[PDB]
Amino acid sequence: AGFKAGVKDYRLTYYTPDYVVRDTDILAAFRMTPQPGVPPEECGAAVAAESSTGTWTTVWTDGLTSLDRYKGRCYDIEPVPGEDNQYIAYVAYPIDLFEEGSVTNMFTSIVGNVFGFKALRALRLEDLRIPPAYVKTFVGPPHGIQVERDKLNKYGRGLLGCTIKPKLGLSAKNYGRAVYECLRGGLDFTKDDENVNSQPFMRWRDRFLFVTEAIYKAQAETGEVKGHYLNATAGTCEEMMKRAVCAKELGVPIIMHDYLTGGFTANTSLAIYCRDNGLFLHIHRAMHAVIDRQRNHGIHFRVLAKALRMSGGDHLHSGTVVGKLEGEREVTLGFVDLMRDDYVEKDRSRGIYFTQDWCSMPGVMPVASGGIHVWHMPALVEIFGDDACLQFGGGTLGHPWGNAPGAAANRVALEACTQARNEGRDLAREGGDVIRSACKWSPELAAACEVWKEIKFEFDTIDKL
Amino acid sequence: AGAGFKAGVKDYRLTYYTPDYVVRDTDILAAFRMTPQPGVPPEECGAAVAAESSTGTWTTVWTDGLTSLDRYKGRCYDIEPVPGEDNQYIAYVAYPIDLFEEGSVTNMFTSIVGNVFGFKALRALRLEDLRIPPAYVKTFVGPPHGIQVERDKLNKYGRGLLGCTIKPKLGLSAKNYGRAVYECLRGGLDFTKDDENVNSQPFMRWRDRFLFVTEAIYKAQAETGEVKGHYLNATAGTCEEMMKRAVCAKELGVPIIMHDYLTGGFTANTSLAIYCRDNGLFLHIHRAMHAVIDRQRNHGIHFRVLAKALRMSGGDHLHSGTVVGKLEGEREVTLGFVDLMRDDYVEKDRSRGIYFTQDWCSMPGVMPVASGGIHVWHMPALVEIFGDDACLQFGGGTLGHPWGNAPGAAANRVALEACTQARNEGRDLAREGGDVIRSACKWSPELAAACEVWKEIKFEFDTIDKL
Amino acid sequence: IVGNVFGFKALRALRLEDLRIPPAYVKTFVGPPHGIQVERDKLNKYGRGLLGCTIKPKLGLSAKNYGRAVYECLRGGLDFTKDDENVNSQPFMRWRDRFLFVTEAIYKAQAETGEVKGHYLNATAGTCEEMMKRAVCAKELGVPIIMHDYLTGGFTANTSLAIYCRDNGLFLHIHRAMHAVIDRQRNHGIHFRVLAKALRMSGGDHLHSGTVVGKLEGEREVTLGFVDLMRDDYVEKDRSRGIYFTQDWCSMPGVMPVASGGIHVWHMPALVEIFGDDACLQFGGGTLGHPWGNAPGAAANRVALEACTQARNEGRDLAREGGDVIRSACKWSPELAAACEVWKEIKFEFDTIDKL
Amino acid sequence: AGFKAGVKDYRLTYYTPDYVVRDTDILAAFRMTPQPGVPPEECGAAVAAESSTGTWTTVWTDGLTSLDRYKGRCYDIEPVPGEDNQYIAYVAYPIDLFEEGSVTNMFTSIVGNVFGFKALRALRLEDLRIPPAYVKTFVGPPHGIQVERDKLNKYGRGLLGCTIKPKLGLSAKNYGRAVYECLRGGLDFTKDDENVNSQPFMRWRDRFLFVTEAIYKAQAETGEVKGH
Amino acid sequence: MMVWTPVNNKMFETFSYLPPLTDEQIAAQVDYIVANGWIPCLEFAEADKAYVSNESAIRFGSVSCLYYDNRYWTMWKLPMFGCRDPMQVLREIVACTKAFPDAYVRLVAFDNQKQVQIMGFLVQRPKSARDWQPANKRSV
Amino acid sequence: MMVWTPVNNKMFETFSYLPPLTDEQIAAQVDYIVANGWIPCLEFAEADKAYVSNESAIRFGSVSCLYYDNRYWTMWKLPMFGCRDPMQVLREIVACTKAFPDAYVRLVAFDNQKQVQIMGFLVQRPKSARDWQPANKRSV
Numbered sequence A: 001a002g003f004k005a006g007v008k009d010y011r012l013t014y015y016t017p018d019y020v021v022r023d024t025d026i027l028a029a030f031r032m033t034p035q036p037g038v039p040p041e042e043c044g045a046a047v048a049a050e051s052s053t054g055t056w057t058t059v060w061t062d063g064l065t066s067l068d069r070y071k072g073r074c075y076d077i078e079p080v081p082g083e084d085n086q087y088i089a090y091v092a093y094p095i096d097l098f099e100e101g102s103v104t105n106m107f108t109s110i111v112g113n114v115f116g117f118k119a120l121r122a123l124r125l126e127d128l129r130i131p132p133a134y135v136k137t138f139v140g141p142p143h144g145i146q147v148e149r150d151k152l153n154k155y156g157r158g159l160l161g162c163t164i165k166p167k168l169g170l171s172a173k174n175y176g177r178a179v180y181e182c183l184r185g186g187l188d189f190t191k192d193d194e195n196v197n198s199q200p201f202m203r204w205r206d207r208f209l210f211v212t213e214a215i216y217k218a219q220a221e222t223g224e225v226k227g228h229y230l231n232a233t234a235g236t237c238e239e240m241m242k243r244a245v246c247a248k249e250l251g252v253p254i255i256m257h258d259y260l261t262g263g264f265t266a267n268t269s270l271a272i273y274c275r276d277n278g279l280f281l282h283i284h285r286a287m288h289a290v291i292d293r294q295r296n297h298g299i300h301f302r303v304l305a306k307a308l309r310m311s312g313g314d315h316l317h318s319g320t321v322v323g324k325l326e327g328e329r330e331v332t333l334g335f336v337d338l339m340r341d342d343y344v345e346k347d348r349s350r351g352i353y354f355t356q357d358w359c360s361m362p363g364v365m366p367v368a369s370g371g372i373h374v375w376h377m378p379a380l381v382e383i384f385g386d387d388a389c390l391q392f393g394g395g396t397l398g399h400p401w402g403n404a405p406g407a408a409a410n411r412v413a414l415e416a417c418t419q420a421r422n423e424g425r426d427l428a429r430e431g432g433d434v435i436r437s438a439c440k441w442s443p444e445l446a447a448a449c450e451v452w453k454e455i456k457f458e459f460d461t462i463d464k465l
Numbered sequence B: 001a002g003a004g005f006k007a008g009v010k011d012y013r014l015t016y017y018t019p020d021y022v023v024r025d026t027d028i029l030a031a032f033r034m035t036p037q038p039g040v041p042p043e044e045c046g047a048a049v050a051a052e053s054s055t056g057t058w059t060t061v062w063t064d065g066l067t068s069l070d071r072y073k074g075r076c077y078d079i080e081p082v083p084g085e086d087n088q089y090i091a092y093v094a095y096p097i098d099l100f101e102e103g104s105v106t107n108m109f110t111s112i113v114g115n116v117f118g119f120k121a122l123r124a125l126r127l128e129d130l131r132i133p134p135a136y137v138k139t140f141v142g143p144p145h146g147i148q149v150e151r152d153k154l155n156k157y158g159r160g161l162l163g164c165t166i167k168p169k170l171g172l173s174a175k176n177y178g179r180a181v182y183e184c185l186r187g188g189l190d191f192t193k194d195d196e197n198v199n200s201q202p203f204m205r206w207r208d209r210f211l212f213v214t215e216a217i218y219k220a221q222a223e224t225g226e227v228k229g230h231y232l233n234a235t236a237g238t239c240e241e242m243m244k245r246a247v248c249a250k251e252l253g254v255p256i257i258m259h260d261y262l263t264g265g266f267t268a269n270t271s272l273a274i275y276c277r278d279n280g281l282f283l284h285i286h287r288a289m290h291a292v293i294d295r296q297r298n299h300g301i302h303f304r305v306l307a308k309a310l311r312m313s314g315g316d317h318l319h320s321g322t323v324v325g326k327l328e329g330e331r332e333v334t335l336g337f338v339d340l341m342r343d344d345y346v347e348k349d350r351s352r353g354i355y356f357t358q359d360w361c362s363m364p365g366v367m368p369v370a371s372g373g374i375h376v377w378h379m380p381a382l383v384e385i386f387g388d389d390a391c392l393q394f395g396g397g398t399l400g401h402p403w404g405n406a407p408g409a410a411a412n413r414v415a416l417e418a419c420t421q422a423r424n425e426g427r428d429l430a431r432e433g434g435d436v437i438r439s440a441c442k443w444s445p446e447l448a449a450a451c452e453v454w455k456e457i458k459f460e461f462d463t464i465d466k467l
Numbered sequence C: 001i002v003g004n005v006f007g008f009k010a011l012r013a014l015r016l017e018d019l020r021i022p023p024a025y026v027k028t029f030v031g032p033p034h035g036i037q038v039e040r041d042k043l044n045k046y047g048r049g050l051l052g053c054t055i056k057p058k059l060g061l062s063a064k065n066y067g068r069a070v071y072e073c074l075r076g077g078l079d080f081t082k083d084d085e086n087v088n089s090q091p092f093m094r095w096r097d098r099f100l101f102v103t104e105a106i107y108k109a110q111a112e113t114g115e116v117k118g119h120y121l122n123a124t125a126g127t128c129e130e131m132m133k134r135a136v137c138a139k140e141l142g143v144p145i146i147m148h149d150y151l152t153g154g155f156t157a158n159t160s161l162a163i164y165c166r167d168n169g170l171f172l173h174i175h176r177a178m179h180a181v182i183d184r185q186r187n188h189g190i191h192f193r194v195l196a197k198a199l200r201m202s203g204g205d206h207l208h209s210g211t212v213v214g215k216l217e218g219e220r221e222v223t224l225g226f227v228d229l230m231r232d233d234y235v236e237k238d239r240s241r242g243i244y245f246t247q248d249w250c251s252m253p254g255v256m257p258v259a260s261g262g263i264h265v266w267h268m269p270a271l272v273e274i275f276g277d278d279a280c281l282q283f284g285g286g287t288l289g290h291p292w293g294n295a296p297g298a299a300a301n302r303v304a305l306e307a308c309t310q311a312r313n314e315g316r317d318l319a320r321e322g323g324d325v326i327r328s329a330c331k332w333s334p335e336l337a338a339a340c341e342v343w344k345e346i347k348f349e350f351d352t353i354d355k356l
Numbered sequence D: 001a002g003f004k005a006g007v008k009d010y011r012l013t014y015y016t017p018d019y020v021v022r023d024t025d026i027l028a029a030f031r032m033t034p035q036p037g038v039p040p041e042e043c044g045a046a047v048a049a050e051s052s053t054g055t056w057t058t059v060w061t062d063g064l065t066s067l068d069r070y071k072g073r074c075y076d077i078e079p080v081p082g083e084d085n086q087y088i089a090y091v092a093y094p095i096d097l098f099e100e101g102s103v104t105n106m107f108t109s110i111v112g113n114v115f116g117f118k119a120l121r122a123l124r125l126e127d128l129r130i131p132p133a134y135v136k137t138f139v140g141p142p143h144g145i146q147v148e149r150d151k152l153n154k155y156g157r158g159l160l161g162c163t164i165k166p167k168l169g170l171s172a173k174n175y176g177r178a179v180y181e182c183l184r185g186g187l188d189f190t191k192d193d194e195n196v197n198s199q200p201f202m203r204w205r206d207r208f209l210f211v212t213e214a215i216y217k218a219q220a221e222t223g224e225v226k227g228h
Numbered sequence E, F: 001m002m003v004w005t006p007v008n009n010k011m012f013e014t015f016s017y018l019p020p021l022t023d024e025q026i027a028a029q030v031d032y033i034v035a036n037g038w039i040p041c042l043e044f045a046e047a048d049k050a051y052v053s054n055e056s057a058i059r060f061g062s063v064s065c066l067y068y069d070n071r072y073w074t075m076w077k078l079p080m081f082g083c084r085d086p087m088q089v090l091r092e093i094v095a096c097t098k099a100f101p102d103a104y105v106r107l108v109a110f111d112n113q114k115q116v117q118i119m120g121f122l123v124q125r126p127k128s129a130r131d132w133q134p135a136n137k138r139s140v
């Protein structure tokens, strides 16, 4: 075989339907919508080529190396039930293609250029099979669920959090004031809003200081370990690290990072710093829905969640199912398993396209947050079980009696539901009764229940399987 | 009694829909293409977007009263219906400058696109444009050098710059990389580059590559007597690895590195841009993953916003699309954001997707890079679309030449200079481009061979990202 | 001395039995960070052997469970616990989590008992940089003691670590993991006494010495010989104990011998008789295998040691009366009685490979 | 299954002849010589136990974790042809047992204590199967053969080296003198003897300097890349 | 509006925001442990060692993150490995509180697959304790 | 199963795990000192200075490794250099405890060749001490 200059079909090299995947290959499932007149085999082959080794015309340099060894391979194509022009194209990437420990590099190949090809109309990465041999190159999360519970000395129930509100506009001292009143009422954590970084109305270091006073006051008052996710998200790696360092020096338990808006490179650095200095790292998924909302195009959240598990985080927001932000039940249960568990079998009814073996990488604590209140508690406990953090921002700071009563109401509701489950009660059916029973001896819960009685979030789901 | 705290849920529009608000010259403005769920009034949907990207949540909080919501709240101040759409609106939101961390693109995105795209109350949402006011622009370091300084340091004037991605994308050894690089640069290309996904890998570790490529740069430069560079990829898994790679480039005395700003991220990118400013390295920006975000008309963020964000975060080059090559980019859309990348002042112009007048207040312009599936026959159109202030890149269009890299580079350089000369002489490249190329073929056998191989090759498909 | 010569075709087998390290060479070494006298002085512990204990199972315990086991062991009367030699940092337990929980356990047990406590935190690592990071964390937690596997980590790393320990006042326990690959066979390799001398020069406050009576090999006379080479300032030639050369240590601090591996309460009289007070005796299985748990296990070992020590001090012959000493102590110590019952029949008696 | 204090055979937990090895397990092949009266199954089990999770008596803490998940397993025993008391015992170790990137840790488990057990007369580690998932945790060699040839620009023949002699006793300048004369005659490399470090007769930095002069002299003279 | 009292209103992690558990409610929690095959265990502490504190941090550099004293309590006997009898757990609660009538005592359970404590709650506080409130006095 | 008590079960290093020493047992320990030619010495401390503590570490950077207060006690007179008479040691124990009836008192001996304390045990604790257990109450 000599060098022959010119354009030929991608499928001649990159469509290999008889390929048997290797246990070290990274696998991708792409929901692919080709342009009219582009065979799905060619479209799949183009995706495989331009995310691995190939370009639009034949290059002579292929001959200096072994394309068989390195090429990405479209090895299977599935039609999508109910769609005339949608296919699941499966692509295998040899492990040699990837930089060890770099989520950034993995994304750069797999989602770098292919989504903009004129030859396709839409493309969505649904899933990735990360093989143990690649998983093992990552530091992964600083601590993980088991270690987190162990350091906090908290067992037998979901954790409780709360975003301070209003989102922006509060002074540093008022932030600490709100934090102290929230924590002292029964919440384990509070947090900076994702967009609270450092601003004219409140500079970060002032906030860290006042919040630290509040954490230690509430802890001493209640006798329970308290934390507040102090935001390290910043414009530069240097500012981000300065903020992490200050939290270390204050001896406080937990910081947060917006992994998508800050980015994987910054996030991985931060996760490593957290591992080395024993800080918990809460991950906020700000901007995920720009990428993961639409069924036909983008990247499903389950891939963003796997990427975060690899890059590093002790917590990651998972959605609520029942709250103000979208997340269908089956989809959510699927990626929650992918975040927490060591081994997750293929299960298309939950959007799990590949069996995923995490080879002992620590599990990430799912955080259910956004538009939830006391009446949601039974469903949340039923959906998530104990290994989750449930967060009530407005559901605390919107309580008619203030933050401490608000926190108490949420903590009462959680513990009542937990007790009821433990006793054999069915939370899906008896949840309303559990809450109403608790209302009899908890005036804080009764007041919360009254204010939010009619409030539901029920809309047509966009991100359907 | 005046206004007390009243617990409970009320409509967002009672606080966040302010159609009579007169925007301030320091406000950040956002244009959102919004698709509400049935039964959600567009005013309420716009108000929810404004609220949940600024100060508000789903129920009334008492803490509002400790501060001034009027001072801090995002405001949906206008709603435009979309011609040809029954359930699409442009919602305009104004954000006070106080909401944003100085110099942090990360923070700006976190507010404006953080949570609102996932709201059950909407079906789809797309950020079309942002008005970045001079008072906020001034908080950013911005690009390490910019177009004028770049040309000045390179001593290159009067034509587009020429680049080229080495191929195959992955799988080449460090020495073969430098071999390909030398052969490309010596034939007349100004630059070559690492593929976006070439970082450090088992088949080729980064530092070996940097070394061999450095030998290739200096060989080609001495041979041709023209300044040469190769965008060495600093993209990495961690900020520490990224910086180590930048440092090595600095110590080798080479001109230019690259970063994948979206896959690496804005926090890392801004850090790198600052390092590049402080050590006089050019920073080429690859927009890997942009199309995940910017392809679809109904949902995501238009590339023009991603381009503004990069200009603020910092980069000397940013890929702009080709219009005519293998990747999508409609002409009018592209011309619009190219102006937003390069120019100091760009007037509102909806016919090019420019929703807001944008004043860059002397922040340096970013060099557009047209790359992807282009070859010699595209040259007239590329020169016509972009003018001189662009870098045109031919990866396959160089390494796919039947005679090898140096002849491939020569063909591209000949085509560019012929088109440039023709334009300078008064010729119309849109009409006479084919003739210009054919004339050059008579005295350039390298060009003739390139023209023959790619004669029939075009990329013409229905456009997804339409205005 | 051992670089190339062992592989020469012209020989069938070669074993380095001994080295005479002259004072003029001894004086070029920093040597052990502290040594026996300083160690006793900083711990405020005198008049009896020290007691240690390896946490078990070797691998597979979480950081918090490690600290849990540690606290229960130390509070019952053990002076020290330790990471297993192969406990470094792993998926089931990362090092820094362990260091933190173990620190809580050390301080809890110390406050509870009113005796100084320690746990040898393993600084053994894949790189010098990781090793140092682990030592630094121990320093910053204010805890007394770390450990290093000097042979698997290596002499270059070990010497560095010993110097760090000297400069920051950390005790350095040395585990001899892999020594038996080298020192087991009579015809070929390097005898342990040379490996012990090398360690003393490179630096360590403790070194494992064998038990004689436990699960791992160590003949009595051989052991007594190298124990003297580890502890003493001047050791005369004595071929009946494998000492081929008179060794003058020229005031280099002595290294504390650590008797560990397959030993239990009934071995106590022999251990005290063999080693005397200047040794650390370690009971891993012999603590965590007690039927009532770690604290009772520790108490049984501490009772046995103190009874034997008292008996020796009173003029009793531990070689002959040891069983009687233990049985007498059983009458007022239910913890010891329960330990004695479980391990009554357990002995380790096999043909010795490493014979003189 | 409660905690039962006391000593039991290692083989009850650590001899698993029906175990199917996982593709991520580290495997070891031990040439094992048991003491008389110690069954090879028990001896192999002892080796597996004491290089992984076990000690000489039952510990209660096993119950807090999953021994099945973590234990080393003697999964096969081969008799050695021509030997009455020698066996190859095969042990599988879960990947979870090992620190990523640490040869030190791997050796510490597999060869740390088991070679000294009274219950065996001799033991030799013949081989290890390092699985890709563990290989991938290592940085590995700085360059490797291909990169080495590429940086040296040397292809198509073996490379030539040479240890300077006498082993010890030469001065720094005489070291450089010997090196220059060696390299200029056609050797690619020379080298310090293994035991040449820094010593009274020749301190390291003096040697590095004189050798550097010699490398560059021979390189300029021959036109071939030289090293020491 | 009722005001959550900051005096003396100490809590005790899981279930301490509910009314004090009846014997029937405790028995039901024990049934839950056994039904799931978890390992029951009792832990106890004297009043001075009951709540999280910071005293050891005096010995530290800048490494106090997630370090607290008094998280560990003292084990009562051993974890009840293999226990499939709720009555056995209840009898150990009686034995533990009898031996230590002035101590804080908590019942916990371990899962050996996740290797983590999977449940826990207080079963005894000393009668001398006055740093806590009855359910109806938590707010005023 | 007996449970080792964590309350108030403070120990005192060598021989504190044995039943309290009789006068005959103390005399035998003194005979051991003299037989070996070691230097007897008595040391004492008031209750507040008896047990190892950390208070000075407040003045430190990251240098608290193997630093504890209350390791040093107060010397009774001088070490009894040249003493070859056990009765003399016993008489000094009497004199020391008479002068300080409420103090902790320990008997130690020094070896001047190794230059280290070579033995030691408590010979008196204040009768007001209640932070320790009799042998048969150490477990419950």
Ligand SMILES: O=C(O)[C@@](O)(COP(=O)(O)O)[C@H](O)[C@H](O)COP(=O)(O)O
Pocket: A163, A165, A167, A193, A194, A285, A286, A317, A318, A319, A320, A325, A367, A368, A369, A370, A371, A372, A391, A392, A393, A394, A395, B052, B057, B058, B115, B118
């Ligand atoms: O800014 C907010 O809306 C929140 O602080 C919740 O506030 P409330 O508790 O007041 O609703 C969280 O950041 C969102 O839940 C993020 O969404 P997700 O978890 O889906 O990423």
Ligand SMILES: O=C(O)[C@@](O)(COP(=O)(O)O)[C@H](O)[C@H](O)COP(=O)(O)O
Pocket: A050, A055, A056, A113, A116, B165, B167, B169, B195, B196, B287, B288, B319, B320, B321, B322, B327, B369, B370, B371, B372, B373, B374, B393, B394, B395, B396, B397
């Ligand atoms: O990986 C590639 O395909 C390229 O190297 C071009 O190769 P060829 O020159 O061989 O076509 C560029 O990265 C794309 O142009 C990126 O797309 P865009 O510029 O649109 O971001």
Ligand SMILES: O=C(O)[C@@](O)(COP(=O)(O)O)[C@H](O)[C@H](O)COP(=O)(O)O
Pocket: C054, C056, C058, C084, C085, C176, C177, C208, C209, C210, C211, C216, C258, C259, C260, C261, C262, C263, C282, C283, C284, C285, C286, D050, D055, D056, D113, D116
């Ligand atoms: O891993 C082990 O087997 C031990 O923890 C002992 O455990 P047990 O107390 O449970 O026996 C020690 O490391 C050995 O004593 C080392 O051998 P040596 O001292 O000869 O170097």
Ligand SMILES: [Mg+2]
Pocket: A163, A192, A193, A194, A195
């Ligand atoms: Mg938020």
Ligand SMILES: [Mg+2]
Pocket: B165, B194, B195, B196, B197
């Ligand atoms: Mg590319």
Ligand SMILES: [Mg+2]
Pocket: C054, C083, C084, C085, C086
């Ligand atoms: Mg061990």
Ligand SMILES: [Mg+2]
Pocket: D163, D192, D193, D194, D195
């Ligand atoms: Mg040699």
